[PDB]
Amino acid sequence: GAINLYSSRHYDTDQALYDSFTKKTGLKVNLIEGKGDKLIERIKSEGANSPADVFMTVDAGRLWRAQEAGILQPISSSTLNNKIPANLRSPEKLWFGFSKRARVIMYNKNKVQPSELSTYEDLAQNKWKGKIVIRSSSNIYNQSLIASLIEIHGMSDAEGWAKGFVRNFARPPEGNDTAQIKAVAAGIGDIGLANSYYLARLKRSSKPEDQAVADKVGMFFPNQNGRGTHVNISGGGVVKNAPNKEGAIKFLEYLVSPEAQKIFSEGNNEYPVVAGVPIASVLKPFGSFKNDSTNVSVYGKLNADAIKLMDRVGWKLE
Ligand SMILES: N[C@H](CCC(=O)O)C(=O)O
Ligand SMILES: [Fe+3]
């Protein structure tokens, strides 16, 4: 009568989702939390004795690592496949996206007009020297973005890009995504890269100071006239030895319902994955944007190459 959810992605507001699921299915949700890579290690080590039914985390790169650890089993569901865009789920049906984030250009509104922005590729141009802030190469979001660039350009051309990008750093990578947004607002950089939901989070904060930062920083969705913006996922899958496989599948299917999509996405100011679900009020002012159709599993497949490239060009680790 229960499922065991091992998640790094729980927010307090998600209790509404678990309670609705229980009303609809009869199944309790037992929550086990941890950091994503630690949960993968925990499930792998628990092995055939693991009680885990569902694993959830952020970033297709981490979901790929879970898949490679052998802790997931494939699921074939008409509901999951029809409702989740193909680009946002594993080609092998091992994991699935349930909310979406974009890795965007954050820009100082005083110093940068959006007409000056275009693509990720343009960020390697000399005009940005001394102007870019971004976090360390240890961060999965950055690894996944670089992986996408290696997929497009190949290692040689991507290395040339990365050499110019790193040359443009205003300071050594320092702090998290929110720290980059604050540095852009403060004039330490004119532009930075961060996930969309971090600006939204500031635009909603209980702290007035957070609203002041948010008002100074715009969000630009790159590559609109070409392949589209780099998107990534919060997602999950059914665990290999799930004691309640049937219940685990019911939970994933419930997550694509319109009501669950709203609660889950809005809990972290992310976009829904399901077509037709209304967008959070905080995200509407930024407008819709073209998403790249690349399958997000590529981000994991080329994660090791991204790490190698980052080291080669001297993009500092945390
Ligand atoms: N950075 C948070 C944490 C969740 C995670 O790191 O798994 C998020 O984007 O939801
Ligand atoms: Fe995050």
Residue numbers in the entry: 4 to 321
Q: What is the paper's account of this structure, in its own sentences?
A:
We have investigated the function and structure of Trichodesmium Tery_3377, an iron stress-induced protein (iron deficiency-induced A, IdiA) commonly used as an in situ marker of iron stress. Using heterologous expression in the model cyanobacteria Synechocystis PCC6803, we provide evidence that Tery_3377, a commonly used iron-limitation biomarker, is localized to the periplasm with a suggested FutA2 function as an iron-binding protein of an ABC transporter. The overall fold of Tery_3377 assumes a classic small molecule ABC transporter substrate-binding domain fold, with two domains hinged over a substrate-binding cleft. The hinge region is formed by two short β-strands and connects the protein domains via a double cross-over between the N (residues 34–133 and 266–349) and C termini (134–265). This type of structure places Tery_3377 among class IV iron-binding proteins (in keeping with Ref. 27) and allows for structural classification within cluster D of the substrate-binding domains.
Amino acid additives in the crystallization buffers lead to the most ordered and best diffracting crystals. The best diffracting crystals were obtained with an additive mixture of amino acids. An amino acid ligand, alanine, is identified in the iron-binding cleft; the amino acid is ordered and coordinates the iron substrate. The geometry observed is trigonal bipyramidal, with the buffer molecule alanine carboxyl group, Tyr-174 and Tyr-231, forming the trigonal plane with angles of 108°, 108°, and 144°. Tyr-230 and the amino group from the buffer alanine coordinate the axial iron positions. The coordinating oxygen of the carboxylic acid moiety of the alanine ligand ideally superposes with a tyrosine side chain oxygen, whereas the amino nitrogen of the alanine ligand superimposes with a nitrogen from an interacting histidine ligand. The two coordinating amino-acids in FutA2 are contributed by a loop that is brought into the vicinity of the iron-binding site by domain closure around the hinge that brings the two lobes of the substrate-binding domain closer together. Interestingly, this motif is conserved in Tery_3377, and such a domain closure, although not observed under any of our crystallization conditions, can be proposed. We conclude that the alanine ligand mimics this iron-binding mode, leading to a pentacoordinated state. The observed binding of organic ligands together with iron may just be a fortuitous observation, but it might also have biological significance. It could be argued that the high concentrations of alanine present in crystallization mixtures out-competes interactions with the N-terminal iron-coordination residues His-43 and Tyr-44, thus leading to preferred crystallization of an open conformation.
